Enzyme design. Structure first.
Site, mmCIF file in Angstrom:
data_model
loop_
_atom_site.group_PDB
_atom_site.id
_atom_site.type_symbol
_atom_site.label_atom_id
_atom_site.label_comp_id
_atom_site.label_asym_id
_atom_site.label_seq_id
_atom_site.Cartn_x
_atom_site.Cartn_y
_atom_site.Cartn_z
ATOM 1 N N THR A 1 0.567 -2.919 8.496
ATOM 2 C CA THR A 1 -0.387 -2.514 8.419
ATOM 3 C C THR A 1 -1.584 -2.657 8.916
ATOM 4 O O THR A 1 -1.603 -3.204 9.715
ATOM 5 C CB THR A 1 -1.038 -2.988 6.643
ATOM 6 O OG1 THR A 1 -1.981 -2.486 6.221
ATOM 7 C CG2 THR A 1 -1.087 -4.018 6.499
ATOM 8 N N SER A 2 -2.449 -1.468 9.621
ATOM 9 C CA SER A 2 -3.776 -1.545 10.349
ATOM 10 C C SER A 2 -4.784 -2.049 9.813
ATOM 11 O O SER A 2 -5.419 -2.337 9.816
ATOM 12 C CB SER A 2 -4.018 -0.178 10.327
ATOM 13 O OG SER A 2 -4.697 0.740 9.695
ATOM 14 N N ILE B 1 3.429 4.355 -0.825
ATOM 15 C CA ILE B 1 3.604 5.029 -1.998
ATOM 16 C C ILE B 1 5.714 5.236 -2.196
ATOM 17 O O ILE B 1 5.874 6.420 -3.015
ATOM 18 C CB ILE B 1 3.279 6.251 -2.411
ATOM 19 C CG1 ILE B 1 2.714 6.758 -1.024
ATOM 20 C CG2 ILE B 1 1.433 5.997 -2.675
ATOM 21 C CD1 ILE B 1 2.987 8.402 -1.847
ATOM 22 N N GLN C 1 1.155 -1.522 0.192
ATOM 23 C CA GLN C 1 0.129 0.409 0.354
ATOM 24 C C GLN C 1 0.694 1.241 0.385
ATOM 25 O O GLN C 1 0.303 2.674 -0.102
ATOM 26 C CB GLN C 1 -0.877 -0.334 1.140
ATOM 27 C CG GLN C 1 -2.246 -1.191 1.322
ATOM 28 C CD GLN C 1 -1.824 -1.364 2.544
ATOM 29 O OE1 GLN C 1 -1.794 -1.776 4.005
ATOM 30 N NE2 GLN C 1 -3.702 -0.984 3.430
ATOM 31 N N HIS D 1 -1.750 0.724 -4.756
ATOM 32 C CA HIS D 1 -2.345 2.592 -3.842
ATOM 33 C C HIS D 1 -0.902 3.660 -5.281
ATOM 34 O O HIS D 1 -1.336 4.723 -5.087
ATOM 35 C CB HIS D 1 -2.520 2.862 -2.784
ATOM 36 C CG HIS D 1 -3.464 2.751 -1.900
ATOM 37 N ND1 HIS D 1 -3.535 2.176 -1.266
ATOM 38 C CD2 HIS D 1 -4.564 1.497 -3.075
ATOM 39 C CE1 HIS D 1 -4.537 1.305 -0.385
ATOM 40 N NE2 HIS D 1 -4.818 1.200 -1.213
ATOM 41 N N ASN E 1 3.274 -7.165 12.655
ATOM 42 C CA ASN E 1 2.057 -6.065 13.331
ATOM 43 C C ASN E 1 2.520 -5.224 14.625
ATOM 44 O O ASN E 1 2.535 -6.389 15.213
ATOM 45 C CB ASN E 1 0.921 -5.846 13.264
ATOM 46 C CG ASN E 1 0.189 -4.648 12.357
ATOM 47 O OD1 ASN E 1 1.612 -3.281 11.445
ATOM 48 N ND2 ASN E 1 0.067 -3.832 12.743
HETATM 49 N N1 LIG Z 1 6.535 8.729 1.499
HETATM 50 C C1 LIG Z 1 5.109 8.213 2.125
HETATM 51 O O1 LIG Z 1 4.888 7.437 1.249
HETATM 52 C C2 LIG Z 1 5.160 8.860 3.194
HETATM 53 C C3 LIG Z 1 3.494 8.376 4.001
HETATM 54 C C4 LIG Z 1 3.495 8.250 4.893
HETATM 55 C C5 LIG Z 1 3.691 9.706 5.517
HETATM 56 N N2 LIG Z 1 5.239 9.842 5.161
HETATM 57 C C6 LIG Z 1 5.588 10.165 4.252
#
Ligand SMILES: NC(=O)c1cccnc1
Ligand SMILES: NC(=O)c1cccnc1
Ligand SMILES: [Zn+2]
Ligand SMILES: [Zn+2]
Lengths: 326, 325
Positions: free
Chosen positions: B241-242, B132, B130, B150, B265
């Site tokens: 993950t939640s 990025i 999930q 995602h 987790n």
């Molecule tokens: N780089 C990232 O994906 C991210 C995700 C959540 C909080 N801060 C950064």
């Protein structure tokens, strides 16, 4: 399309918004139905009260039907009389009207016979019937091939101790509007009518015999899910006949069957919330005869000479939809 | 096992009852998990943001996570900065915060290397992530083996004309809190945003990074892959993950009922029924597992991790609290 398994609830309920089933491009006609009939080996036939109205047995939803009679008596919701939870709370609601639903016996229609035909030709996977009139067995449908989805008056059971007897034993009490009582529970029942032994914890259904028909809010007979688990893996044609298809889980059979399987309706009215490949709109006895005949088959029922000698009209009326008269 | 029909999985990102799954009677210890790892060949690993907190990247909902750092915005739901309807209507809301979610490069955690380890042993069917942050690439997890459920900043797309470009072309605009505009739509954009009809949205001719917003459809690799993978999966491991976002959170319902499901987790996932739950930090629990398997995680921190003593305290059947000291 991506899917997960959605458990099919097995408690009898009104099913009650596009249907998502897609109709087969390759299968709309009458002639398509006929060729399928000749090649099919595992037909699922799903029936409702429409297949017994030629015999003078009312259906539920039409103008002269059961719901209309119960409403005319004064019940605000005529559905109430077949409500399980209502039965468990007050069995007089149902037994006030039960004489109206006690069926005739030892008769059957051309349609029930068209079903036996399929069986004899080795093509019937199952007949799933909604009807409690118990007319299929007499018509010759074998017990392994019949699923009485919603039970019948064959037997009645005490809701308290689960003693079971032939239904016939309680018919005279039902005709005389008397509550059929369990002989084993009867002594405790009189005692009741300790906190746990008083109002409100003892219901009015205590020690009352209930016919083994499936009420709204009750679990279907176990034969149903055990059968459909398997028949779903192997059905190669689905025919729905003489039903509005408004009661789940029976109504979900159309969604459970694999999407490549042709689905045909034979009914007086279209079923709006379903997407049948072919709909044959008219009287089921007439459409049966017609179909058998186009197949070069015969229906082992008295009325067959007569039905077979009619002039059938098949008016196209949109693709995959015929209005059949005669 | 209950008689079932097919239900279409909704492919729109949605922040998410009761769970129906029955736990496996023969699988609830750590040793059942070690034994299964030896024999499994088609392991599905599902990850979330907890796999990169060891690298200094905030997750979303911990007490120093991303939602905590945008509290000052005073949103009713801080997820709204990533809501798609909001984007289409007013992209400056996302673009105010986008700088905070740009990924670092060229770093990855021991848990990322544990996934790569699985890969190079021929046991990884897929890593559904999930995240990025795109750190799986750096860790050596293959593009074929990775589903970025995602999306990522790899590419950006004009919401009007669909022109697609490398996502890095908008990073300098993101860093300056500016809207990145499409060069092809720009002429019409400048006409409307110097008359403008009320049905032209503020997103007209705006580039959007190809990350999945709440209320947007998932990338096509997701449904294409999951459909085939659930037929073959022989072990599911959900890590960091939640599991609160669908359809990813539905993977645990989609895998057939006989496949063992393991959670690794910091916290239990109360709305799921894992066969085995290991509760602690990913990296530590990955190391302890690899140790018990007689395996090596290909990560510079292996020698540090292999020198730790892990304690596994059984709390409840199939629930173990794993700590280090
Ligand atoms: N780089 C990232 O994906 C991210 C995700 C959540 C909080 N801060 C950064
Ligand atoms: N009249 C009725 O209530 C009735 C009887 C048989 C079948 N369906 C309805
Ligand atoms: Zn009794
Ligand atoms: Zn554009």
């Amino acid at each position: 399309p991506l899917a997960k398994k959605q458990t099919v609830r097995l408690i009898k309920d009104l099913q009650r918004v596009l249907c998502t089933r897609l109709r087969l491009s390759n299968f709309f006609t009458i002639d398509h139905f006929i060729q399928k009939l000749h090649t099919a080996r595992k037909i699922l036939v799903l029936t409702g009260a429409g297949v017994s109205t030629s015999l003078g047995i009312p259906d539920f939803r039409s103008s002269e039907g059961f719901y209309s009679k119960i409403k005319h008596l004064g019940l605000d919701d005529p559905q109430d009389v077949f409500n399980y939870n209502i039965f468990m709370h007050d069995p007089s609601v149902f037994y006030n009207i039960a004489n109206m639903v006690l069926p005739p016996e030892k008769i059957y229609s051309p349609l029930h016979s068209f079903i036996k035909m399929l069986q004899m030709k080795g093509k019937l996977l199952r007949n799933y019937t909604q009807n409690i009139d118990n007319l299929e067995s007499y018509a010759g449908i074998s017990t392994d091939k019949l699923v009485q989805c919603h039970g019948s008056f064959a037997t009645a059971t005490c809701v308290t101790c689960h003693w079971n007897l032939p239904g016939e034993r309680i018919f005279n009490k039902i005709r005389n509007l008397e509550l059929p009582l369990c002989p084993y529970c009867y002594k405790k029942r009189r005692e009741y009518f300790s906190m746990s032994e008083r109002p409100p914890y003892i219901l009015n259904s205590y020690g009352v015999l209930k016919p083994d028909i499936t009420f709204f809010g009750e679990a279907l007979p176990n034969k149903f899910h055990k059968s459909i688990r398997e028949d779903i893996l192997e059905c190669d044609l689905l025919i729905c006949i003489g039903t509005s298809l408004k009661v789940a889980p029976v109504s979900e059979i159309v969604n459970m069957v694999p999407s490549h399987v042709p689905q045909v309706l034979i009914n007086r009215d279209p079923v709006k919330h379903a997407e049948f490949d072919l709909s044959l709109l008219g009287y089921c006895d007439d459409i049966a005869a017609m179909v058998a005949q186009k197949c070069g088959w015969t229906i082992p029922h008295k009325k067959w000479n007569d039905l077979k000698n009619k002039n059938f009209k098949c008016q196209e009326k949109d693709k995959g939809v015929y209005v059949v008269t005669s």
